[PDB]
Amino acid sequence: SEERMQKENKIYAPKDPHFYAVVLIKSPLRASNKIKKTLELFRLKHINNCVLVKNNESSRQMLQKIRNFVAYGELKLKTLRELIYKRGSCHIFSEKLNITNETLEDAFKNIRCIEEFIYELYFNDERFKELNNFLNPFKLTPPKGGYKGRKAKDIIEGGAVGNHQDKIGELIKKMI
Amino acid sequence: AINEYKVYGIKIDDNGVVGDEVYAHIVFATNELLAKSSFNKILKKQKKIKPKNTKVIKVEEIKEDNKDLDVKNYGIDYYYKSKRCDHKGYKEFRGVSRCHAVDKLLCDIGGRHSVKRNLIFIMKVKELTVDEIKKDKIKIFAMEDVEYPAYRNVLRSNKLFVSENEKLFN
Amino acid sequence: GRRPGRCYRYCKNKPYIKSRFCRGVPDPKIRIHDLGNKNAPCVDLPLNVNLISYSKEQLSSESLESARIAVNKYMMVNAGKDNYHVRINVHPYHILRINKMLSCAGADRLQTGMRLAYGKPYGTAARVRFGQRIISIRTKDSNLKMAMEALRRARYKFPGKYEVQKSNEYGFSGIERSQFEELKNNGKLINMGDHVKIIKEKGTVERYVKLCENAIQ
Amino acid sequence: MLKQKMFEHYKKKAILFDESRVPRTKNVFYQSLFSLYKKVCENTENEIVHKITKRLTMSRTERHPLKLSNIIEQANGKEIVVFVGKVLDDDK
Amino acid sequence: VSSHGYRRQTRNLFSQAFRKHGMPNTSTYLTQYAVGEYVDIKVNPAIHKGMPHKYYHGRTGIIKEVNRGSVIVLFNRILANKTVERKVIVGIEHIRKSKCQDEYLKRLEINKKIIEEAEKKGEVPVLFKRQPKGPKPAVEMLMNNIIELSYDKVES
RNA sequence: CAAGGUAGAGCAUGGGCCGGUAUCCUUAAGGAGACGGACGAACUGCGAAUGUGCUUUUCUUCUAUGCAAGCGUAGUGGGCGAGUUCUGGUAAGCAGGACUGGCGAAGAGGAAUGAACCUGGCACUGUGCUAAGGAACCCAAUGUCUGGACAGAGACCGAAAGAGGUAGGUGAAUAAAAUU
């Protein structure tokens, strides 16, 4: 496609992705009640938790309120795979469990292996709610080699919170 | 270290490609995110398109060759913010790349005027021949007329204590 | 006597003005605002020089009066009476208060200490902000170095920072010198003492004609 | 889809027996009867059985009595009626 | 210290707008009201009977009862950390019909068609929900007509 | 979808400071003035951001180890402090309000020491990693590059006013190296 387009002096820019990934970088214990409620609705509870969220106008206004606590951005397929394979897990209602063939078949009548799960999650938009709400929040370690500056500054200022765009993969890869 | 990037972008509303114009901007920055930040800054001040109505279509890095590390002369036009106002000026440097030239200016102004790197703006970078040089500083080095000896001593070994009768420096 | 200037320097309180609500206020010390050749036509005194504020504070009516005398005496001796015009731009409308207390304190029938503490009128001041023009001069172009030195003497009478600066403007018009000449030639200006009115193609034609016969050229 | 699934789960869990409740009486004949119903509940979803088992655990005041005529008034045309409590005579 | 009369602190409120003094227009008197409509309170300072208390100015409620020249409207209010319903009497000169239900009523008109067809042909409605604005769309660009941008303005 | 009059901006009703060309009125003074500059917590012609309420799950997102009418009954009714703002006062570790988190009733690691500041909320053990803050020695971990700076200075530290030394920017000259 890129060849055909360049061969006729035109640029193509794909649609923005359907989901962002969010990581809780610093402690919320002194934030206001309005902030605490917003973190609850995104299922974030302890430091170094990571979670996936629908890209949508409501979500983008929720993120604006909490941007001083969280790093966020977009995630390509290679990193999504390493996350699910190395740190993924699930729940039925109050029972926490490992992702196995029996448990997929039970929950989603037509997904049978962990590779089909990752494929649907990335490529099918209309099933995102069901597919996302099956996974538990990911529990990560602090990054290997530490943070370079005062993490509470914005990424533009040289810290660690805010919008890392196409480059969140680098933070997550040090935290798996 | 500093790098050079060129960012391209368009306007959008409730529907796509609302203007047929494309806008471009060359910038020296450390990474792509600091590049994209600058593009947003200039659009909002020279036009009035805020981020929610913009989309970046491309970011590209610009790189030279210089396999033999040949040394060249450059002139740079800049401004910076102080406590009073904004101060414009021009200075000349030598180096193996445009980025090598630009990193030396940023270091200079931080040393001489006590300014953080984000308050300095580059307006123009130009490569020059020997007849073009304006100020005094680099001309002797450009005309190839310099030799000098070493002022700093250098340690011979990593050991902390050594015998009195050994050679200590260089 | 008076309290020292540090007591009333910064703009702590809201404006407070002589009115039906506030009575028994003393007169300000400065009363005279224009000096020199007041009615000289705008064209005759092209150079403009100002004292400009780099601070946000209150200036007492006592300080303004001392500066007037200082600036005027210099210009009068050096420029001559007919060659200059000085204007002091700021007016002391704000009222200061004092909560007066006795020396032989500790015990009295008078209500002592911080009981019923709201103060009575004490004096007046002008309130000033950054980049404001405090004193302004217009003169002949020969008198730059004289006008500079006149304004320097005011700079020691007020708290904070102030700078003497030269303007782009013609006189006490608001017009840059380049543009003024371009409107003067081509007949567009009407003199009104220290300033000018610009003729425009806006009204009825018989009025336009009647204006144009009055132009400066 | 999901919002319905969730609510239909809550409605069910609101009916079923809690299994961390027990009657306070030291009467061994009453405690026998509860044991039967408890073992039936863990092998069924039927709402009538769950309701009965929850009511055996409530206090004497919660098990308020009914008169014969009021049972008939509430029977609504059914043949068998069930009541966790004591049935008294109506003189009227 | 302050006082506590019925029209305390209403100097800004309860005053006419610039060039809008005088009595109300005919449309005010010819509007018909019904139980269950949503209505919006805005006091006209020139009319001295049937005025509500100034807490209710600019609030919207629901019509409970209709009389000759006045209406009873239901409101809710927090007092002592509990919710209380309040029944406010207002004259027809101080009210206007509320716009707050407008979009919902349009949506109901569309739903009312589908919900009938859903019995005949399908089994359940598609129901036409609103969705929040999604991600930024994709674009194909011709790449002539490039415009360059530069820090040419020195800003002395 | 409503309501609002603060910050900014303005001086069209009311209060109110200084100066005015032509022209006008008298005087042979003064006054008025087609206009400019300066202003109000109890001046307004215009008007934000943040905050408040209403409807819609027929609207995203979360939700049972969750909410909870009703009944019975406790303690409390001297508060204090930080950040952002306000009123009285020359001010105050002073007196008095508003909003969002604390100490009270909160330990642990860090600011040498400190109720409230930074990191961050505690059952009991074991192995790894990071925060804030550090890395000659006291004391677990330290080095490198480029400019400035000589004062028993600085790393900890006061004003209006200023010359001297040195490093750079911009604008004027002159030039038989440059200089002002």
Short mmCIF file of N, CA and C in Angstrom, two decimals, chain C residues 82-191:
data_model
loop_
_atom_site.label_atom_id
_atom_site.label_comp_id
_atom_site.label_asym_id
_atom_site.label_seq_id
_atom_site.Cartn_x
_atom_site.Cartn_y
_atom_site.Cartn_z
N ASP C 82 9.04 78.82 27.03
CA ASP C 82 8.20 78.68 25.85
C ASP C 82 8.55 77.45 25.00
N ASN C 83 9.48 76.61 25.47
CA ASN C 83 10.06 75.54 24.67
C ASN C 83 9.65 74.13 25.11
N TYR C 84 8.80 73.98 26.15
CA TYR C 84 8.53 72.67 26.72
C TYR C 84 7.14 72.61 27.37
N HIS C 85 6.63 71.38 27.56
CA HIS C 85 5.40 71.12 28.29
C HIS C 85 5.56 69.83 29.08
N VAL C 86 5.26 69.89 30.40
CA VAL C 86 5.31 68.76 31.32
C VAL C 86 3.90 68.42 31.80
N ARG C 87 3.60 67.12 31.88
CA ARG C 87 2.33 66.65 32.43
C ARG C 87 2.58 65.53 33.43
N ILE C 88 1.92 65.63 34.59
CA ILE C 88 1.94 64.58 35.60
C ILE C 88 0.62 63.84 35.51
N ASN C 89 0.71 62.57 35.10
CA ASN C 89 -0.40 61.83 34.53
C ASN C 89 -1.34 61.29 35.60
N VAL C 90 -0.82 61.02 36.81
CA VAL C 90 -1.53 60.25 37.83
C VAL C 90 -2.15 61.17 38.89
N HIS C 91 -3.37 60.82 39.36
CA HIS C 91 -4.13 61.61 40.32
C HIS C 91 -4.38 60.82 41.60
N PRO C 92 -4.10 61.37 42.80
CA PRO C 92 -4.23 60.62 44.05
C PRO C 92 -5.65 60.50 44.62
N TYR C 93 -6.43 59.54 44.09
CA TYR C 93 -7.83 59.36 44.45
C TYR C 93 -8.06 58.44 45.65
N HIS C 94 -7.12 57.55 45.99
CA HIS C 94 -7.28 56.58 47.08
C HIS C 94 -7.03 57.22 48.45
N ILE C 95 -7.86 56.89 49.45
CA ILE C 95 -7.75 57.40 50.81
C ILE C 95 -7.11 56.36 51.74
N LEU C 96 -6.07 56.78 52.47
CA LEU C 96 -5.39 55.98 53.48
C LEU C 96 -6.04 56.21 54.84
N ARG C 97 -5.94 55.22 55.75
CA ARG C 97 -6.55 55.30 57.08
C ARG C 97 -5.50 55.11 58.18
N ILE C 98 -5.80 55.63 59.39
CA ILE C 98 -4.98 55.43 60.58
C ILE C 98 -5.87 55.07 61.77
N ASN C 99 -5.40 54.12 62.59
CA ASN C 99 -6.04 53.73 63.83
C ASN C 99 -5.22 54.31 64.97
N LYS C 100 -5.50 55.57 65.30
CA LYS C 100 -4.71 56.35 66.23
C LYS C 100 -4.90 55.84 67.66
N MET C 101 -3.78 55.78 68.40
CA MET C 101 -3.73 55.28 69.77
C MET C 101 -2.83 56.17 70.62
N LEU C 102 -3.17 56.27 71.91
CA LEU C 102 -2.50 57.11 72.89
C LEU C 102 -1.16 56.52 73.32
N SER C 103 -0.25 57.40 73.77
CA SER C 103 1.08 57.04 74.25
C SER C 103 1.01 56.50 75.68
N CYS C 104 0.19 57.14 76.52
CA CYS C 104 0.01 56.78 77.92
C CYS C 104 -1.05 55.68 78.04
N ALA C 105 -0.80 54.56 77.36
CA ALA C 105 -1.73 53.46 77.18
C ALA C 105 -1.70 52.49 78.37
N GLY C 106 -2.50 51.42 78.26
CA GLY C 106 -2.59 50.39 79.30
C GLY C 106 -3.92 50.46 80.06
N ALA C 107 -4.35 51.69 80.38
CA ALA C 107 -5.60 51.94 81.09
C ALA C 107 -6.15 53.33 80.77
N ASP C 108 -7.36 53.35 80.19
CA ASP C 108 -8.13 54.55 79.90
C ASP C 108 -9.61 54.20 79.72
N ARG C 109 -10.47 55.23 79.73
CA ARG C 109 -11.90 55.12 79.46
C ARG C 109 -12.15 55.00 77.95
N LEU C 110 -11.28 55.63 77.15
CA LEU C 110 -11.20 55.41 75.71
C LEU C 110 -11.05 53.91 75.45
N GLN C 111 -11.64 53.42 74.36
CA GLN C 111 -11.63 51.99 74.07
C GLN C 111 -10.25 51.57 73.54
N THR C 112 -9.45 50.96 74.43
CA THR C 112 -8.04 50.64 74.21
C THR C 112 -7.85 49.32 73.44
N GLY C 113 -6.69 49.22 72.76
CA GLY C 113 -6.27 48.05 71.99
C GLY C 113 -6.95 47.95 70.63
N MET C 114 -7.21 46.70 70.21
CA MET C 114 -7.82 46.37 68.93
C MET C 114 -9.35 46.36 68.99
N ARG C 115 -9.98 46.87 70.07
CA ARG C 115 -11.42 47.05 70.10
C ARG C 115 -11.82 48.22 69.20
N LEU C 116 -12.84 48.03 68.35
CA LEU C 116 -13.36 49.02 67.42
C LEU C 116 -12.24 49.70 66.63
N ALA C 117 -11.53 48.90 65.83
CA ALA C 117 -10.24 49.27 65.28
C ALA C 117 -10.28 50.00 63.93
N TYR C 118 -11.44 50.14 63.27
CA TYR C 118 -11.53 50.75 61.95
C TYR C 118 -11.07 52.21 61.99
N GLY C 119 -10.20 52.59 61.04
CA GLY C 119 -9.42 53.83 61.13
C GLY C 119 -10.14 55.03 60.53
N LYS C 120 -9.54 56.22 60.71
CA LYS C 120 -10.05 57.49 60.21
C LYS C 120 -9.20 57.94 59.03
N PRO C 121 -9.64 58.88 58.15
CA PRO C 121 -8.83 59.30 57.00
C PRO C 121 -7.53 60.00 57.39
N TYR C 122 -6.45 59.70 56.67
CA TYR C 122 -5.10 60.08 57.06
C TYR C 122 -4.40 60.91 55.98
N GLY C 123 -4.66 60.58 54.72
CA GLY C 123 -4.01 61.17 53.56
C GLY C 123 -4.44 60.44 52.29
N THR C 124 -3.78 60.72 51.16
CA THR C 124 -4.17 60.18 49.87
C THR C 124 -2.97 59.77 49.02
N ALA C 125 -3.22 58.88 48.04
CA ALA C 125 -2.20 58.30 47.18
C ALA C 125 -2.77 57.91 45.82
N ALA C 126 -1.89 57.74 44.84
CA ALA C 126 -2.24 57.23 43.52
C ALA C 126 -1.80 55.78 43.38
N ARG C 127 -2.61 54.94 42.72
CA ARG C 127 -2.33 53.52 42.56
C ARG C 127 -1.86 53.25 41.14
N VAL C 128 -0.77 52.49 41.01
CA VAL C 128 0.07 52.45 39.82
C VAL C 128 0.39 50.99 39.51
N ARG C 129 0.60 50.66 38.23
CA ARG C 129 0.84 49.29 37.80
C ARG C 129 2.00 49.25 36.81
N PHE C 130 2.40 48.05 36.37
CA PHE C 130 3.58 47.93 35.52
C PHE C 130 3.34 48.58 34.16
N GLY C 131 4.39 49.20 33.61
CA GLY C 131 4.38 49.72 32.26
C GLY C 131 3.57 51.01 32.10
N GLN C 132 3.23 51.66 33.21
CA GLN C 132 2.42 52.87 33.18
C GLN C 132 3.31 54.11 33.04
N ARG C 133 2.78 55.16 32.41
CA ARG C 133 3.49 56.42 32.19
C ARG C 133 3.19 57.39 33.33
N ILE C 134 4.20 57.73 34.14
CA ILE C 134 3.96 58.49 35.36
C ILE C 134 4.11 59.99 35.12
N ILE C 135 5.18 60.41 34.41
CA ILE C 135 5.44 61.79 34.03
C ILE C 135 5.84 61.81 32.55
N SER C 136 5.36 62.82 31.80
CA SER C 136 5.61 62.94 30.36
C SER C 136 6.04 64.35 29.99
N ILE C 137 7.00 64.46 29.04
CA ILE C 137 7.50 65.73 28.51
C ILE C 137 7.37 65.75 26.98
N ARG C 138 7.06 66.93 26.39
CA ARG C 138 7.30 67.24 24.98
C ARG C 138 8.15 68.51 24.80
N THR C 139 9.09 68.47 23.83
CA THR C 139 10.10 69.49 23.56
C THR C 139 10.58 69.49 22.10
N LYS C 140 11.45 70.47 21.80
CA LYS C 140 12.27 70.51 20.59
C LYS C 140 13.26 69.35 20.62
N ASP C 141 13.73 68.92 19.43
CA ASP C 141 14.60 67.74 19.30
C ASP C 141 16.03 68.01 19.79
N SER C 142 16.39 69.29 19.94
CA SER C 142 17.70 69.71 20.43
C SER C 142 17.89 69.41 21.92
N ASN C 143 16.78 69.14 22.63
CA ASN C 143 16.77 69.16 24.09
C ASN C 143 16.67 67.76 24.69
N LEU C 144 17.10 66.73 23.94
CA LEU C 144 17.05 65.35 24.40
C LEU C 144 17.81 65.17 25.71
N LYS C 145 19.08 65.58 25.74
CA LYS C 145 19.96 65.35 26.89
C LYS C 145 19.51 66.13 28.12
N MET C 146 18.85 67.27 27.90
CA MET C 146 18.28 68.09 28.96
C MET C 146 17.06 67.41 29.59
N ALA C 147 16.15 66.92 28.74
CA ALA C 147 14.93 66.27 29.17
C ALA C 147 15.22 64.98 29.94
N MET C 148 16.24 64.24 29.50
CA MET C 148 16.69 63.03 30.18
C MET C 148 17.09 63.35 31.62
N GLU C 149 17.88 64.41 31.78
CA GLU C 149 18.44 64.77 33.06
C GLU C 149 17.36 65.32 33.99
N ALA C 150 16.39 66.04 33.44
CA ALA C 150 15.24 66.50 34.21
C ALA C 150 14.50 65.32 34.84
N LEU C 151 14.19 64.29 34.05
CA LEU C 151 13.41 63.16 34.52
C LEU C 151 14.20 62.29 35.50
N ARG C 152 15.53 62.23 35.35
CA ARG C 152 16.37 61.49 36.28
C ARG C 152 16.11 61.94 37.72
N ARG C 153 15.87 63.24 37.91
CA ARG C 153 15.75 63.80 39.25
C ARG C 153 14.47 63.35 39.95
N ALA C 154 13.45 62.92 39.20
CA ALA C 154 12.20 62.43 39.77
C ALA C 154 12.38 61.02 40.33
N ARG C 155 13.32 60.27 39.75
CA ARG C 155 13.52 58.85 39.98
C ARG C 155 13.92 58.55 41.43
N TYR C 156 14.41 59.56 42.17
CA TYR C 156 14.90 59.41 43.53
C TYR C 156 13.84 59.78 44.56
N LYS C 157 12.67 60.25 44.12
CA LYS C 157 11.59 60.69 44.98
C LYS C 157 10.52 59.61 45.21
N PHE C 158 10.58 58.47 44.49
CA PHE C 158 9.54 57.44 44.56
C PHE C 158 10.10 56.07 44.95
N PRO C 159 9.35 55.18 45.65
CA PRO C 159 9.87 53.86 46.00
C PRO C 159 9.84 52.95 44.77
N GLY C 160 10.77 52.00 44.69
CA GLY C 160 10.77 51.03 43.61
C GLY C 160 11.57 51.47 42.38
N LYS C 161 11.32 50.80 41.25
CA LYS C 161 12.06 51.00 40.01
C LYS C 161 11.22 51.83 39.03
N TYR C 162 11.89 52.73 38.29
CA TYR C 162 11.35 53.56 37.23
C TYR C 162 12.45 53.84 36.23
N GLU C 163 12.10 53.93 34.95
CA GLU C 163 13.08 54.12 33.89
C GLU C 163 12.71 55.33 33.03
N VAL C 164 13.73 56.07 32.59
CA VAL C 164 13.55 57.17 31.64
C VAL C 164 13.69 56.59 30.24
N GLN C 165 12.68 56.80 29.39
CA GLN C 165 12.68 56.26 28.03
C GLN C 165 12.13 57.28 27.03
N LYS C 166 12.63 57.20 25.78
CA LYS C 166 12.24 58.03 24.64
C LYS C 166 11.20 57.29 23.81
N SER C 167 10.24 58.02 23.21
CA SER C 167 9.10 57.44 22.52
C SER C 167 9.24 57.50 21.00
N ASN C 168 8.46 56.66 20.30
CA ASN C 168 8.28 56.67 18.85
C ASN C 168 7.27 57.74 18.41
N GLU C 169 6.51 58.29 19.36
CA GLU C 169 5.34 59.09 19.03
C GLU C 169 5.75 60.52 18.71
N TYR C 170 4.94 61.19 17.88
CA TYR C 170 5.03 62.63 17.68
C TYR C 170 4.31 63.32 18.84
N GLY C 171 5.04 64.05 19.68
CA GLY C 171 4.37 64.90 20.66
C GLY C 171 3.52 64.10 21.65
N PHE C 172 2.38 64.68 22.07
CA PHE C 172 1.39 63.98 22.87
C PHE C 172 0.26 63.43 21.98
N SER C 173 0.49 63.31 20.67
CA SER C 173 -0.37 62.49 19.83
C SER C 173 -0.07 61.01 20.10
N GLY C 174 -0.93 60.13 19.63
CA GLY C 174 -0.62 58.73 19.80
C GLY C 174 0.04 58.13 18.56
N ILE C 175 0.53 58.98 17.66
CA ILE C 175 0.90 58.57 16.31
C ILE C 175 2.42 58.50 16.20
N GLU C 176 2.92 57.40 15.61
CA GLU C 176 4.34 57.24 15.31
C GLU C 176 4.79 58.28 14.29
N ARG C 177 6.05 58.74 14.40
CA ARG C 177 6.53 59.92 13.69
C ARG C 177 6.39 59.76 12.17
N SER C 178 6.73 58.56 11.67
CA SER C 178 6.66 58.20 10.27
C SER C 178 5.24 58.40 9.72
N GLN C 179 4.26 57.87 10.45
CA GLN C 179 2.86 57.90 10.05
C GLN C 179 2.30 59.32 10.13
N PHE C 180 2.75 60.10 11.11
CA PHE C 180 2.27 61.45 11.31
C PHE C 180 2.57 62.32 10.08
N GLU C 181 3.81 62.26 9.60
CA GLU C 181 4.26 63.02 8.44
C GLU C 181 3.49 62.64 7.17
N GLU C 182 3.16 61.35 7.06
CA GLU C 182 2.43 60.79 5.93
C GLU C 182 0.96 61.21 5.91
N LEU C 183 0.40 61.58 7.07
CA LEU C 183 -0.96 62.08 7.20
C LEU C 183 -1.00 63.61 7.14
N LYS C 184 0.07 64.26 7.59
CA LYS C 184 0.19 65.71 7.62
C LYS C 184 0.26 66.24 6.20
N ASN C 185 1.26 65.80 5.44
CA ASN C 185 1.23 65.90 3.99
C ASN C 185 0.04 65.06 3.53
N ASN C 186 -0.68 65.47 2.48
CA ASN C 186 -1.91 64.79 2.09
C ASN C 186 -3.12 65.19 2.96
N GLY C 187 -2.94 66.13 3.91
CA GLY C 187 -4.01 67.02 4.36
C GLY C 187 -5.04 66.46 5.35
N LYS C 188 -4.67 65.42 6.12
CA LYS C 188 -5.69 64.67 6.86
C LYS C 188 -5.81 65.09 8.33
N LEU C 189 -5.00 66.05 8.80
CA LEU C 189 -4.90 66.35 10.23
C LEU C 189 -5.51 67.71 10.59
N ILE C 190 -6.19 67.78 11.74
CA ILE C 190 -6.73 69.02 12.30
C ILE C 190 -6.11 69.19 13.68
N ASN C 191 -5.61 70.40 13.98
CA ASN C 191 -4.94 70.69 15.24
C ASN C 191 -5.98 70.96 16.33
#
